[PDB]
């Protein structure tokens, strides 16, 4: 993950999700966009 | 009572004989302390419940002193469990099932080879010591124009704390 | 049916005006406690019988930590003071009512 | 309502319903809670509110099939959330630290190691900022923020 | 038929408070009128005893009794062993009964008899200004004039 | 309550011209009336 | 200096301790402090602080009574309120006027 | 009252002892009206110098209930003044060690800074559950009425109130649910 | 006598027993002590109020340290009662 202030879906298959109280943007076809929200 | 898992026994109190030397089978010297067991008399037994604390527990006493040189309620004490007076009396944290009548004699076998065991005594005292042999303090110089500090704590804190941390090293009993 | 307070815990009051609207009148009687309310007042053969009379002494910090248990206070109440304050002190106070 | 049984045979049934009761006091109302007078009026507490509203293992049901504004729906879901942390929902359960009014996931808070001087002093959230409109009842307004 | 309004049973559709009626005017003037003739009668038979009142004098209220003491913060005018009237009495209580005035009591209703027993000065009162750093230091002592008066009766009236 | 005073026009400070402030405080036991208040 | 000062304290410290006393009379009546007084203003009773006190520990049936008082002009007060047009003004809220 | 000098003297100076109940309740509401009857705010013969504060007795401070994530959020902050010794435990964990030291806490912070405060804290009595000791519970008068009224769980409200409540939303008849 | 109470003039010893010889002398049952009100009771600083009823009427009521320093008292109170010598009675006239 990097961690980002402005969250993107740089994919199709990049979804956001909001856990641990943070929102996330996680893609199960390309790890490298996985993003945590600072 | 039998043992189950979970249990704990009592101790004793043993006089440190002193040390010899002891070689295994391998040919390796492994020095040993002797402790005698002089006599040991269980004492006293506290219930959970009047013991406030988790676990029962069973007071050992060890060698015998005089009772000219005793006090009276302790003397009083050992004579309504019909036993001359102890040099130290020991608690001994112990389950239900380790309850051992008082006045009972204990003994060295208790204790069986090749068992291990905890040991707790009062160390040897050094009076008041400096942090050289209290806290392994480095010291200072010998020559090379020092004046008269060679064995001295350098800076006991720094100039912001307008003070002294608690606990911090320094000169006192050891 | 309407009570401005409760009355059942000290007196019962009723509030009045007066024709001319210039007085207030209040009538408040004691309210007394019901019988019902209340509850009962709680209730060597050969030797005389000596007085039990021990007193152990208590070394001074027990006895305070006795005394502070008693009163539920601290220890500092029953430490003593010294000559100034003692001195300081007016042993013959004024007295009103 | 409908449900599924599974024996391979998987059929559907059409079980009883409810009926919304019968003369609502306000009939042009848009959504259930406009037609029940019921604007600004209802809590977490009010449970009797929230289990008509929510499923049967703790889940909402949806905004077009309940007839709720998105307002409302929204105010629901937030006290649908805070009513199950404090416990007053225990028949909708899924599959000990007394709350309520708890508006945050009680697994996903920091503690609060550094609040800051008295002027950005990081407060504690009570509460649910949706039901700021909600009926005073007081002269004081609710303290959202402790 | 749920009239036009009804709010259902939820925590915030009614407001925390009871519902409370007050009495209607007609039967609570009546109710009025004969705690008011009681509590006359009991001014006429003579049941109480030991009255206190709330009287307004020298800017001030005072609680007071009969045979009490009360110290004026200033001269008064009347001479020692002097009887005279206090006329503003706020209120008159007794056990049992207490009498409100709006704001003042009626003085057919109570009389306030006091007797000035004492012209004093009070204890030397020191007033003193100092500043810091600029030479500012001021003494200046008072005594302010005083007049002890003694409350001798206070006797009420049937007039309510 | 200085608002709802000054509402029935009764000043705000009830040490402000009523009856409270400016009737005389007392009057000699016989009925005389007392000499006039300085203030 | 400290003494010329605490004259000033002195009377803020007294004023302190009345609204105190007569705070915990009125709980006791299970009334507020702001009600008991400023429905007393408009009952037009002009009883201060230090006589209010006063008899909240020496006269407590007289207490009772203006607690009483105060709070059938606060529920009087609040039926205005609700009423909100020309019913009568309520038997202890009419005022004695003065000309 | 017609009582002689001492034991009217003895009646107005008495020592009350007040039952609060946790159990579902704000820690600072319990503490506020704790220490109101600690200091004896509460008599009208209140005077800072006439030691004049009740005994409280607190019972069910284990099951005492936070507001919001303050069970999470609040932080207990202490510092054994030894260097690294700056300790801080969340709400939760301090509730886990020691049952009553929340509202202990809590008393304590309500109570005047002044040296009258431990005083009025031996005072105060704390019981973790429904045990109370035997003397103690000889020495009560009046229960006080606890602050928060309890939401009341869905599952405890009769079939009365239940059928008294309207049902709001007609639903679908073909709706899974 | 102006600001005195009754058994600070008058000495008396037993009042319960005045009390009684008075009540049998105007035709009353005899008064039955009652625990009115109770605080403390365990500890060094309890307070009683221990009243006195007759035909469960309630003549008198007394505080004190002990449930007997109560029961005086309310002997006490109840003879002050039944002289008129009480402190709310009216004042002399002079
Ligand atoms: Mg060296
Ligand atoms: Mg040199
Ligand atoms: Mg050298
Ligand atoms: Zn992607
Ligand atoms: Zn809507």
Same mark, same amino acid.
């Given at each position: 993950?990097?961690?980002?202030?402005?969250?993107?879906?740089?994919?199709?298959?990049?979804?956001?999700?909001?856990?641990?109280?943070?929102?996330?943007?996680?893609?199960?076809?390309?790890?490298?966009?996985?993003?945590?929200?600072? | 009572?039998?043992?189950?898992?979970?249990?704990?026994?009592?101790?004793?109190?043993?006089?440190?004989?002193?040390?010899?030397?002891?070689?295994?089978?391998?040919?390796?010297?492994?020095?040993?302390?002797?402790?005698?067991?002089?006599?040991?008399?269980?004492?006293?037994?506290?219930?959970?419940?009047?013991?406030?604390?988790?676990?029962?527990?069973?007071?050992?006493?060890?060698?015998?002193?005089?009772?000219?040189?005793?006090?009276?309620?302790?003397?009083?004490?050992?004579?309504?469990?019909?036993?001359?007076?102890?040099?130290?009396?020991?608690?001994?944290?112990?389950?239900?099932?380790?309850?051992?009548?008082?006045?009972?004699?204990?003994?060295?076998?208790?204790?069986?080879?090749?068992?291990?065991?905890?040991?707790?005594?009062?160390?040897?005292?050094?009076?008041?010591?400096?942090?050289?042999?209290?806290?392994?303090?480095?010291?200072?110089?010998?020559?090379?124009?020092?004046?008269?500090?060679?064995?001295?704590?350098?800076?006991?804190?720094?100039?912001?704390?307008?003070?002294?941390?608690?606990?911090?090293?320094?000169?006192?009993?050891? | 049916?309407?009570?401005?307070?409760?009355?059942?815990?000290?007196?019962?009051?009723?509030?009045?005006?007066?024709?001319?609207?210039?007085?207030?009148?209040?009538?408040?009687?004691?309210?007394?406690?019901?019988?019902?309310?209340?509850?009962?007042?709680?209730?060597?053969?050969?030797?005389?019988?000596?007085?039990?009379?021990?007193?152990?002494?208590?070394?001074?910090?027990?006895?305070?930590?006795?005394?502070?248990?008693?009163?539920?206070?601290?220890?500092?109440?029953?430490?003593?003071?010294?000559?100034?304050?003692?001195?300081?002190?007016?042993?013959?106070?004024?007295?009103?009512? | 309502?409908?449900?599924?049984?599974?024996?391979?045979?998987?059929?559907?049934?059409?079980?009883?319903?409810?009926?919304?009761?019968?003369?609502?006091?306000?009939?042009?109302?848009?959504?259930?809670?406009?037609?029940?007078?019921?604007?600004?009026?209802?809590?977490?507490?009010?449970?009797?509110?929230?289990?008509?509203?929510?499923?049967?293992?703790?889940?909402?049901?949806?905004?077009?099939?309940?007839?709720?504004?998105?307002?409302?729906?929204?105010?629901?879901?937030?006290?649908?959330?805070?009513?199950?942390?404090?416990?007053?929902?225990?028949?909708?359960?899924?599959?000990?630290?007394?709350?309520?009014?708890?508006?945050?996931?009680?697994?996903?808070?920091?503690?609060?190691?550094?609040?800051?001087?008295?002027?950005?002093?990081?407060?504690?959230?009570?509460?649910?900022?949706?039901?700021?409109?909600?009926?005073?009842?007081?002269?004081?307004?609710?303290?959202?923020?402790? | 038929?749920?009239?036009?309004?009804?709010?259902?049973?939820?925590?915030?559709?009614?407001?925390?408070?009871?519902?409370?009626?007050?009495?209607?005017?007609?039967?609570?003037?009546?109710?009025?009128?004969?705690?008011?003739?009681?509590?006359?009668?009991?001014?006429?038979?003579?049941?109480?005893?030991?009255?206190?009142?709330?009287?307004?004098?020298?800017?001030?209220?005072?609680?007071?009794?009969?045979?009490?003491?009360?110290?004026?913060?200033?001269?008064?005018?009347?001479?020692?062993?002097?009887?005279?009237?206090?006329?503003?009495?706020?209120?008159?209580?007794?056990?049992?009964?207490?009498?409100?005035?709006?704001?003042?009591?009626?003085?057919?209703?109570?009389?306030?008899?006091?007797?000035?027993?004492?012209?004093?000065?009070?204890?030397?009162?020191?007033?003193?200004?100092?500043?810091?750093?600029?030479?500012?230091?001021?003494?200046?002592?008072?005594?302010?004039?005083?007049?002890?008066?003694?409350?001798?009766?206070?006797?009420?009236?049937?007039?309510? | 309550?200085?608002?709802?005073?000054?509402?029935?026009?009764?000043?705000?400070?009830?040490?402000?011209?009523?009856?409270?402030?400016?009737?005389?405080?007392?009057?000699?036991?016989?009925?005389?009336?007392?000499?006039?208040?300085?203030? | 200096?400290?003494?010329?000062?605490?004259?000033?304290?002195?009377?803020?410290?007294?004023?302190?301790?009345?609204?105190?006393?007569?705070?915990?009379?009125?709980?006791?009546?299970?009334?507020?402090?702001?009600?008991?007084?400023?429905?007393?203003?408009?009952?037009?009773?002009?009883?201060?602080?230090?006589?209010?006190?006063?008899?909240?520990?020496?006269?407590?049936?007289?207490?009772?009574?203006?607690?009483?008082?105060?709070?059938?002009?606060?529920?009087?007060?609040?039926?205005?309120?609700?009423?909100?047009?020309?019913?009568?003004?309520?038997?202890?809220?009419?005022?004695?006027?003065?000309? | 009252?017609?009582?002689?000098?001492?034991?009217?003297?003895?009646?107005?100076?008495?020592?009350?002892?007040?039952?609060?109940?946790?159990?579902?309740?704000?820690?600072?509401?319990?503490?506020?009206?704790?220490?109101?009857?600690?200091?004896?705010?509460?008599?009208?013969?209140?005077?800072?110098?006439?030691?004049?504060?009740?005994?409280?007795?607190?019972?069910?401070?284990?099951?005492?209930?936070?507001?919001?994530?303050?069970?999470?959020?609040?932080?207990?902050?202490?510092?054994?003044?030894?260097?690294?010794?700056?300790?801080?435990?969340?709400?939760?964990?301090?509730?886990?060690?020691?049952?009553?030291?929340?509202?202990?806490?809590?008393?304590?912070?309500?109570? /005047? +800074?002044? $040296?009258?405060?431990? %005083?009025?804290? &031996?005072?105060?009595?704390?019981?973790?559950?429904?045990?109370? @000791? #035997? *003397?103690?519970?000889?020495?009560?008068?009046?229960?006080?009425?606890?602050?928060?009224?309890? /939401? +009341?769980? $869905?599952?405890?409200? %009769?079939?009365? &109130?239940?059928?008294?409540?309207?049902?709001?939303?007609?639903? @679908? #008849? *073909?709706?899974?649910? | 006598?102006?600001?005195?109470?009754?058994?600070?003039?008058?000495?008396?010893?037993?009042?319960?027993?005045?009390?009684?010889?008075?009540?049998?002398?105007?035709?009353?049952?005899?008064?039955?002590?009652?625990?009115?009100?109770?605080?403390?009771?365990?500890?060094?600083?309890?307070?009683?109020?221990?009243?006195?009823?007759?035909?469960?009427?309630?003549?008198?009521?007394?505080?004190?340290?002990?449930?007997?320093?109560?029961?005086?008292?309310?002997?006490?109170?109840?003879?002050?009662?039944?002289?008129?010598?009480?402190?709310?009675?009216?004042?002399?006239?002079?």
């Amino acid at each position: 993950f990097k961690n980002k202030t402005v969250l993107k879906k740089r994919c199709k298959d990049c979804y956001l999700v909001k856990r641990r109280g943070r929102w996330y943007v996680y893609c199960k076809t390309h790890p490298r966009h996985k993003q945590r929200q600072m | 009572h039998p043992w189950e898992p979970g249990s704990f026994r009592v101790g004793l109190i043993a006089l440190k004989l002193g040390m010899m030397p002891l070689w295994t089978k391998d040919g390796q010297k492994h020095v040993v302390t002797l402790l005698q067991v002089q006599d040991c008399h269980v004492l006293k037994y506290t219930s959970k419940e009047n013991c406030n604390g988790k676990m029962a527990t069973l007071s050992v006493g060890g060698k015998t002193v005089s009772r000219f040189r005793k006090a009276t309620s302790i003397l009083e004490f050992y004579r309504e469990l019909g036993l001359p007076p102890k040099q130290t009396v020991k608690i001994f944290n112990i389950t239900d099932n380790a309850a051992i009548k008082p006045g009972t004699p204990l003994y060295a076998a208790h204790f069986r080879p090749g068992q291990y065991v905890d040991v707790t005594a009062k160390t040897i005292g050094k009076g008041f010591q400096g942090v050289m042999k209290r806290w392994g303090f480095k010291g200072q110089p010998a020559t090379h124009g020092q004046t008269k500090t060679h064995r001295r704590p350098g800076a006991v804190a720094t100039g912001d704390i307008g003070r002294v941390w608690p606990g911090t090293k320094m000169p006192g009993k050891m | 049916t309407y009570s401005p307070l409760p009355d059942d815990y000290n007196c019962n009051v009723e509030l009045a005006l007066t024709s001319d609207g210039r007085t207030i009148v209040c009538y408040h009687p004691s309210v007394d406690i019901p019988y019902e309310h209340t509850k009962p007042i709680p209730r060597d053969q050969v030797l005389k019988t000596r007085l039990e009379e021990k007193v152990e002494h208590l070394e001074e910090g027990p006895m305070i930590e006795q005394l502070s248990k008693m009163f539920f206070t601290t220890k500092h109440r029953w430490y003593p003071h010294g000559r100034y304050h003692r001195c300081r002190k007016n042993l013959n106070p004024p007295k009103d009512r | 309502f409908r449900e599924v049984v599974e024996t391979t045979i998987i059929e559907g049934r059409i079980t009883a319903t409810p009926k919304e009761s019968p003369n609502p006091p306000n009939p042009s109302g848009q959504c259930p809670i406009c037609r029940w007078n019921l604007k600004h009026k209802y809590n977490y507490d009010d449970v009797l509110l929230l289990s008509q509203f929510i499923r049967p293992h703790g889940g909402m049901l949806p905004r077009k099939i309940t007839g709720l504004c998105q307002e409302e729906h929204r105010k629901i879901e937030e006290c649908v959330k805070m009513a199950h942390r404090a416990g007053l929902l225990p028949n909708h359960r899924p599959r000990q630290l007394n709350r309520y009014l708890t508006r945050w996931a009680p697994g996903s808070v920091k503690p609060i190691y550094k609040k800051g001087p008295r002027w950005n002093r990081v407060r504690m959230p009570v509460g649910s900022p949706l039901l700021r409109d909600n009926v005073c009842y007081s002269r004081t307004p609710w303290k959202l923020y402790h | 038929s749920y009239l036009p309004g009804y709010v259902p049973k939820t925590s915030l559709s009614s407001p925390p408070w009871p519902e409370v009626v007050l009495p209607d005017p007609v039967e609570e003037t009546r109710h009025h009128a004969e705690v008011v003739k009681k509590v006359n009668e009991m001014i006429v038979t003579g049941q109480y005893g030991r009255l206190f009142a709330v009287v307004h004098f020298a800017s001030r209220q005072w609680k007071v009794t009969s045979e009490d003491l009360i110290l004026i913060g200033n001269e008064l005018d009347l001479a020692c062993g002097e009887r005279i009237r206090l006329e503003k009495v706020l209120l008159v209580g007794a056990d049992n009964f207490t009498l409100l005035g709006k704001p003042l009591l009626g003085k057919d209703l109570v009389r306030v008899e006091a007797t000035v027993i004492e012209k004093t000065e009070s204890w030397p009162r020191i007033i003193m200004r100092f500043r810091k750093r600029k030479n500012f230091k001021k003494k200046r002592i008072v005594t302010t004039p005083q007049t002890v008066l003694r409350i001798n009766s206070i006797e009420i009236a049937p007039c309510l | 309550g200085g608002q709802w005073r000054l509402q029935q026009g009764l000043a705000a400070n009830p040490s402000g011209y009523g009856p409270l402030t400016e009737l005389p405080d007392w009057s000699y036991a016989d009925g005389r009336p007392a000499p006039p208040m300085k203030g | 200096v400290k003494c010329t000062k605490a004259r000033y304290l002195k009377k803020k410290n007294m004023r302190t301790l009345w609204i105190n006393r007569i705070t915990a009379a009125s709980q006791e009546h299970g009334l507020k402090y702001p009600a008991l007084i400023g429905n007393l203003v408009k009952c037009q009773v002009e009883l201060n602080r230090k006589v209010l006190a006063d008899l909240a520990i020496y006269e407590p049936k007289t207490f009772k009574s203006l607690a009483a008082l105060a709070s059938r002009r606060r529920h009087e007060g609040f039926a205005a309120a609700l009423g909100d047009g020309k019913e009568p003004e309520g038997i202890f809220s009419r005022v004695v006027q003065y000309h | 009252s017609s009582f002689s000098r001492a034991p009217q003297q003895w009646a107005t100076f008495a020592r009350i002892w007040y039952l609060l109940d946790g159990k579902m309740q704000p820690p600072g509401k319990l503490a506020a009206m704790a220490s109101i009857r600690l200091q004896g705010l509460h008599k009208p013969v209140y005077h800072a110098l006439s030691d004049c504060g009740d005994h409280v007795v607190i019972m069910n401070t284990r099951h005492i209930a936070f507001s919001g994530n303050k069970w999470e959020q609040k932080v207990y902050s202490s510092h054994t003044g030894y260097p690294g010794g700056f300790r801080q435990v969340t709400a939760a964990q301090l509730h886990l060690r020691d049952p009553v030291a929340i509202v202990k806490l809590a008393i304590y912070g309500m109570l /005047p +800074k002044n $040296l009258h405060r431990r %005083t009025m804290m &031996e005072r105060l009595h704390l019981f973790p559950d429904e045990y109370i @000791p #035997e *003397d103690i519970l000889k020495n009560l008068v009046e229960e006080l009425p606890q602050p928060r009224k309890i /939401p +009341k769980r $869905l599952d405890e409200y %009769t079939q009365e &109130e239940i059928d008294a409540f309207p049902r709001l939303w007609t639903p @679908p #008849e *073909d709706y899974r649910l | 006598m102006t600001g005195k109470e009754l058994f600070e003039m008058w000495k008396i010893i037993n009042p319960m027993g005045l009390l009684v010889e008075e009540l049998k002398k105007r035709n009353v049952s005899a008064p039955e002590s009652r625990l009115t009100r109770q605080s403390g009771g365990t500890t060094a600083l309890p307070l009683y109020f221990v009243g006195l009823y007759c035909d469960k009427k309630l003549i008198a009521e007394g505080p004190g340290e002990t449930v007997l320093v109560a029961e005086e008292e309310a002997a006490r109170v109840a003879l002050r009662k039944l002289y008129g010598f009480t402190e709310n009675r009216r004042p002399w006239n002079y």
